[PDB]
Design a protein around this ligand. Structure first.
Ligand SMILES: [Cl-]
Ligand SMILES: [Cl-]
Ligand SMILES: [Cl-]
Ligand code: NA
Ligand code: NA
Length: 129
């Protein structure tokens, strides 16, 4: 599913990501834009052999099982394929774990490099939320 911007904002808000670990909704929407262009089916191979999955490009080295990431963990207790669903619940549950792991949203390189410190409120402009 390719979410609209406001459509994603509303779903993330409903699932409790606004202010989660102190990160305002626009941070999450910005991260999703640059991670997946709001496409739940997005995937990305990494150089280490892990893969990133879904709306927030959650990685198989620690967070989900894909059966092809040697030595990896599955801290969200999910198949990575679940991160590709049109329903973002699994991605949100897992993102909450990730952002709680110590480095906040820096865990998303795209967020640090493209969203951090920017006008993230612009991401939710116009949305009826
Ligand atoms: Cl915001
Ligand atoms: Cl694996
Ligand atoms: Cl933080
Ligand atoms: Na990524
Ligand atoms: Na894994």
């Amino acid at each position: 599913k390719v979410f609209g911007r406001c459509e994603l904002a509303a779903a993330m808000k409903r699932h409790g990501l606004d202010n989660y670990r102190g990160y305002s909704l626009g941070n999450w929407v910005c991260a999703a834009k640059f991670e997946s262009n709001f496409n739940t089916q997005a995937t990305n191979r990494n150089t280490d052999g892990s893969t990133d999955y879904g709306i927030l490009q959650i990685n198989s080295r620690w967070w989900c099982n894909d059966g092809r990431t040697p030595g990896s963990r599955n801290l969200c207790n999910i198949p990575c394929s679940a991160l590709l669903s049109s329903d973002i619940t699994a991605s949100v549950n897992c993102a909450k774990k990730i952002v709680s792991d110590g480095n906040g949203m820096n865990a998303w390189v795209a967020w640090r490099n493209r969203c951090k410190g920017t006008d993230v409120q612009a991401w939710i402009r116009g949305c009826r939320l």
